Amino acid sequence: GQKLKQDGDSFRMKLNTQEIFDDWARKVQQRNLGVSGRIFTIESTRVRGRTGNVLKLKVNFLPEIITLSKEVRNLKWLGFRVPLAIVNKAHQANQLYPFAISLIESVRTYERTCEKVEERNTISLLVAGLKKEVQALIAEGIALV
Amino acid sequence: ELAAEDEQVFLMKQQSLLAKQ
Amino acid sequence: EVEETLKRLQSQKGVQGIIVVNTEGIPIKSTMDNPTTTQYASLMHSFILKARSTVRDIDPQNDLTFLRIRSKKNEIMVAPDKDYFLIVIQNPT
Amino acid sequence: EVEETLKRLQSQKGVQGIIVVNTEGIPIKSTMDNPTTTQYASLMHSFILKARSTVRDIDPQNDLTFLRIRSKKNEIMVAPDKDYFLIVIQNPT
Amino acid sequence: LTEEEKQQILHSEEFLSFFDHSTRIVERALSEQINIKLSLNRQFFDERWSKHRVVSCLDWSSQYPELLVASYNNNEDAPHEPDGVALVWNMKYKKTTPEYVFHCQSAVMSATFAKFHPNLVVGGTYSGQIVLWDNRSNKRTPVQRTPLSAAAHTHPVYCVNVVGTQNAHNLISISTDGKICSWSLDMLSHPQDSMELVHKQSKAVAVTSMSFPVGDVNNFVVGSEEGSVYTACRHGSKAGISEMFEGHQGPITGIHCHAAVGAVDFSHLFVTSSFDWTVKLWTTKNNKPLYSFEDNADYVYDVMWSPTHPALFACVDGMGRLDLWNLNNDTEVPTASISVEGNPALNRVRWTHSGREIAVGDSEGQIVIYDVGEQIAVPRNDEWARFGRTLAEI
């Protein structure tokens, strides 16, 4: 009986769990995830296939941030307490996620449809008005923090 | 008539605006 | 036994016993209305003979015993041995 | 699609040869050679036109949507609806 | 001799009915009519749409009790190739090939048939975008897609279902965020209803799966990855969480209400398969679990009642074994068991309509269907009475 209980206690000691929680929290704090900044970012990329530098339009929002939220949204009920700054960042990211995902899907769809249009140059002249209004809407949005 | 204003020019202009803001 | 064959065939769905058509287009066995079945068997015999010619064109060693003429109303199973050509009306269901 | 259609219709049994025929006979496609495909499919088209006449005899509203003949040496397939005439070369078994 | 007319008619795609009837008929032509206890029945493993692919969901079509739908996430094998893989599989005549295929630009998480229309198939994806597909038409793309908006689902959707009858239908969906949304089959672009499920102090419930009492609409039941099972009314006099259950320690993965209907009323019995081998049976009127299933550890995913037998259900273990668990004959030992060869991580189990056989998903994608013993499939009035008294046991 005592040998068995010693075996089980040793196994349980090997079966501790908090250390990984601690390491993950430390990694989160070190990496300093965030979303604050511009509504979306315009960047420079030299896409292979063309000599020029393409100013492809992206969204200032890492899709992985929500993952962190879910971790917290789990670890909180797991009984492990996470630092208040991390709680705040995860909560803000979770509440703000829907807007970001709608934005990114919308901009990707717009890019796909505009490249489809310009693939057929015979039609861009007609669609120019819609492209103008969309560009105006993007121009209005981009200035926002 | 309506103009196209190629996406690259608009993108670079707004890149400049974001840089300066 | 011819009667055994008849009772075995009538057990099939939508089949009224056994009707056999010889090479003259006249059914040696009578199970349905005579004029319709006779003309139908005559057209049967004609097109199965042209099918026999068609296959022998490129297959001079094949024999015909299976053919599934199925429509949205009924299927006709036509099976020639050498002179006796069984024609069987069966529901597609 | 085209290639996927033939590929899937073929590898289901390792079929020896099928070509897509959307026209009334005389197909220019080939699977093992031009003649044995084109002439045989034209013969099939001629035969199935007669078979369609045969099925229309008993009632003109009838049309043939599916046709198979399984003989001692070959199994021939065609499913016509308006112009789509199938060909299948396959073992009797 | 034509050279381009055949080429252009091949290029022109008017082959919709052509391909439809050709496919529905050639597998029929596969028949070899040449004139010259558990037991496996049919093992299905598509080589083209299931190479190293994980079963995500399963469903049997009530309208056509030979038609099955199965899902898949994105394929790690190749990202460039289509990611959301959906398979419609048939039980007319044996064939290695799936009867229908379907693709979604997002990884597919769950899928099912529509009760309102016997041909439409509806499936929730990993992006939280409900996807509609028309079986009769020959297409690969989703026919319809719910918008990705704050009002609509945005987190990955894992349970979708159709409630009501064929003229009082309603498509209810859950996102793992806690959003319930009610749509209609005639339009899939705007939520007829939508609200964020909340238990208390406005905190949401991370819903993983949900079910409903057989023969009833509204008054839904959901399971939470937090390890807690809730009953929440759809509309009632007040929507939202109505009751919180003591529940199981780990995440609640597969939840199902009882479905068999007979001389007694058992529509209040819930089976939940958590992450601890623990298939818990309870009733909605009691806050505590009525019994516990324990023979191993570590993750039995899903549990599902048999629609014909009232005291019999199935649960499949990630260890790679499906045991058919009966209550009237036993309470501690499975009355039947079997293991899929290769010992694979069997994900999902689905009782077929009318029962008498089972469907099993796998991490490898090789879904297997197979029947049950006749002496165990069929119930009897004795089964209902003794089941009532076994409930009366404790």
Side-chain angles (χ1 to χ4, degrees), chain E residues 339-356:
Chain E
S339 166
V340 169
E341 298 79 14
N343 208 7
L346 294 174
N347 176 287
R348 191 96 197 214
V349 54
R350 168 62 72 169
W351 274 95
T352 199
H353 294 292
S354 78
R356 201 77 192 83

Side-chain angles (χ1 to χ4, degrees), chain A residues 1-141:
Chain A
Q2 55 203 89
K3 181 186 322 196
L4 182 145
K5 85 174 172 64
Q6 273 155 103
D7 301 343
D9 197 25
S10 60
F11 184 42
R12 179 166 310 177
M13 183 278 288
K14 294 176 283 185
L15 195 59
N16 194 33
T17 191
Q18 203 167 11
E19 53 275 18
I20 298 103
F21 164 56
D22 307 330
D23 298 333
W24 166 89
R26 168 165 45 248
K27 294 180 179 67
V28 160
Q29 300 189 290
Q30 283 153 339
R31 194 259 167 269
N32 182 26
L33 295 90
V35 291
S36 312
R38 193 58 59 187
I39 285 295
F40 49 86
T41 180
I42 179 65
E43 62 93 26
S44 304
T45 178
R46 196 267 186 189
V47 183
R48 305 285 104 85
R50 276 87 62 197
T51 46
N53 182 14
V54 178
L55 291 176
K56 201 178 188 319
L57 187 48
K58 270 88 168 189
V59 169
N60 190 2
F61 188 85
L62 307 187
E64 55 210 349
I65 188 69
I66 185 178
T67 295
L68 186 149
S69 79
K70 300 156 101 174
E71 275 282 333
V72 166
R73 211 204 55 222
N74 206 60
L75 264 58
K76 183 178 65 179
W77 71 260
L78 277 178
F80 305 85
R81 161 183 70 261
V82 286
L84 290 178
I86 304 185
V87 185
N88 182 27
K89 274 180 194 172
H91 168 71
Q92 182 263 0
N94 189 8
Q95 55 84 17
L96 207 54
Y97 183 82
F99 297 161
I101 181 65
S102 292
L103 167 69
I104 187 169
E105 61 86 20
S106 307
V107 66
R108 177 187 40 78
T109 301
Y110 157 72
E111 286 204 72
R112 182 179 63 248
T113 186
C114 78
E115 66 182 1
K116 156 159 69 171
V117 164
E118 64 89 20
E119 192 274 335
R120 217 173 192 181
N121 303 114
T122 63
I123 202 153
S124 60
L125 186 63
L126 287 160
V127 189
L130 302 182
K131 197 171 178 62
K132 285 308 162 71
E133 65 207 64
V134 169
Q135 289 167 256
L137 211 47
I138 287 166
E140 185 269 333

Side-chain angles (χ1 to χ4, degrees), chain E residues 174-249:
Chain E
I174 193 66
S175 183
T176 196
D177 187 20
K179 290 190 210 173
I180 60 162
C181 293
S182 297
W183 276 282
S184 57
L185 202 54
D186 53 12
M187 162 295 298
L188 278 82
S189 300
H190 191 242
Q192 292 179 303
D193 180 60
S194 44
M195 62 66 58
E196 170 79 63
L197 187 61
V198 159
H199 171 226
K200 54 179 200 298
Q201 70 274 16
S202 161
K203 61 94 177 177
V205 165
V207 186
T208 292
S209 176
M210 59 96 89
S211 175
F212 83 81
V214 62
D216 182 56
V217 187
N218 192 350
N219 184 32
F220 264 109
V221 180
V222 294
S224 65
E225 85 178 347
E226 190 178 355
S228 175
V229 177
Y230 309 93
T231 317
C233 193
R234 187 178 54 147
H235 314 298
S237 64
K238 174 259 303 176
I241 292 302
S242 55
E243 172 64 20
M244 181 305 298
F245 280 70
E246 304 172 54
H248 178 278
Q249 191 265 6

Side-chain angles (χ1 to χ4, degrees), chain E residues 52 79 96 98 184 205 278 298 371:
Chain E
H52 184 74
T96 301
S184 57
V205 165
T278 305
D298 309 336
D371 63 358

Side-chain angles (χ1 to χ4, degrees), chain C residues 47 61-63 72-73, chain D residues 61 63 71-74:
Chain C
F47 89 86
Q61 68 273 13
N62 208 349
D63 191 9
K72 64 179 72 66
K73 273 78 178 176
Chain D
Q61 57 94 19
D63 55 350
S71 276
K72 274 84 169 183
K73 275 79 185 175
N74 64 334

